[PDB]
């Protein structure tokens, strides 16, 4: 049935972004993805019980709409939801969130003599990504300046990279990182492989759509322009995000045949049948490939990762090693990349920042668990020893705590 809960939609000049329908309580029939209502927690099927603290039981459809459209400011709704996931992310939605309050406090920190970077970090790294979008809209509405552009001018160094990354939606951030990894002579293959190998179907579908809107070209077309050989074939196949979905039935016969084919195409023979590896590892569901990799050990003297190191080299080897890691244990995969970015001289800040930003609301808690288990000390500890200043503090907030 759903308990009466309060959602707070920020003032939006383009509309709150949800459809009111009814016949008695009016219900929400559809929600614009990424719109103001979507970010505040309004979901499909919500029955509207109060609009800005007035009970609308028995009101007409026009009256509920007119009450919603009246103030032209924020929209506080009391909704009854069909009782319905970011449960392992470090950054949670801030309770008692007020975008206007945060926007004004952020502008105060920007206008503070010398720029109050501390307050900017304390706010933005302790709000969810959707809450940051609400702040950005309220900021522009009161300053007539875009928040990202204002923060670009106020901040610098690695802290600027972090803050600007947090302000983008997940699909916008991934799309811009992909573009940055391909733009310019050559390519950051490691950045391209990390994103393409680790993102799921749903994520890649939104990345492809957002990439096309941001840059007016297909992501697949830019991957082709900047890659070649079997590496291109693998990246193009993964980037389509059309992997088979996790099924209810375990296909034990296919698991065995897939494991034989991987062996026959690689260790068993001289050379490698690279397209056979690509077909199996990009088309089968992740739970399927997990069991394929264990069954593969029944035929091969080396496991899947070791077989890759012996068969292929270069970018293709890197891509296969990253992909198999993501299929086997993705939190452990990111934990190892985090360790690699800090273990030696200096810091691979680009990698550290991108992981802390993109995984903060996905599986950072599992990343921290795999990290502490494998390396003995916390991810928090390594960030402290490798980074300094407000830049360090923002990364520590994205981490979420010690251990």
């Amino acid at each position: 049935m759903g308990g009466p809960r309060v959602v707070r939609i920020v003032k939006s000049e383009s509309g709150y972004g949800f459809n009111v329908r009814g016949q008695p309580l009016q219900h929400v029939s559809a929600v614009l993805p990424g719109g103001a209502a979507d970010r505040a927690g309004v979901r499909k099927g919500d029955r509207i019980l109060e609009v800005n603290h007035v009970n609308v039981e028995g009101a007409t459809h026009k009256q509920v709409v007119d009450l919603i459209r009246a103030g032209e400011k924020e929209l506080i709704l009391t909704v009854l939801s069909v009782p319905p996931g970011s449960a392992y992310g470090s950054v949670k939605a801030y309770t008692n969130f007020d975008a206007e309050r945060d926007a004004l406090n952020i502008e105060t920190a920007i206008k503070t003599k010398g720029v109050d970077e501390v307050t900017i970090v304390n706010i933005l790294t302790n709000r969810s990504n959707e809450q940051r979008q609400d702040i950005a809209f309220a900021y522009q509405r009161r300053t007539k300046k875009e928040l990202a552009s204002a923060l670009k001018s106020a901040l610098s160094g690695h802290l600027e990279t972090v803050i600007l990354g947090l302000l983008k939606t997940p699909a916008q951030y991934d799309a811009s990182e992909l573009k940055a990894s391909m733009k310019g002579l050559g390519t950051d293959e490691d950045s391209l492989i990390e994103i393409i190998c680790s993102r799921t179907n749903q994520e890649l579908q939104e990345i492809n759509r957002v990439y096309k809107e941001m840059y007016k070209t297909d992501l697949e077309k830019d991957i082709i322009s900047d890659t070649s050989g079997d590496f291109r074939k693998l990246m193009v196949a993964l980037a389509k995000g059309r992997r088979a979905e996790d099924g209810s039935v375990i296909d034990y016969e296919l698991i065995d045949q897939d494991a034989r084919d991987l062996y026959d195409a690689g260790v068993k023979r001289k050379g490698t049948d690279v397209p056979k590896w690509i077909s199996i590892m990009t088309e089968r569901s992740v739970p399927h490939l997990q069991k394929v990799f264990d069954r593969y050990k029944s035929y091969s003297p080396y496991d899947m990762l070791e077989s890759i190191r012996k068969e292929v080299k270069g970018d293709l080897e890197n891509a296969f090693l990253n992909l198999v890691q993501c299929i086997q244990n993705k939190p452990l995969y990111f934990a190892d990349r985090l360790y690699d970015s800090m273990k030696g001289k200096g810091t691979r800040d680009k990698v550290l920042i991108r992981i802390m930003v993109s995984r903060s609301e996905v599986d950072m808690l599992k990343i921290r668990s795999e990290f502490k288990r494998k390396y003995g000390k916390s991810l928090y500890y390594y960030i402290q020893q490798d980074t300094k200043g407000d830049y360090q503090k923002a990364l520590l907030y994205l981490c979420g705590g010690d251990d």
Binding site: Y16, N19, V20, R21, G22, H61, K62, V65, I68
Partner: peptide, 6 residues
Amino acid sequence: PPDEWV
């Protein structure tokens, strides 16, 4: 059924 976007 009446509907409208807001």
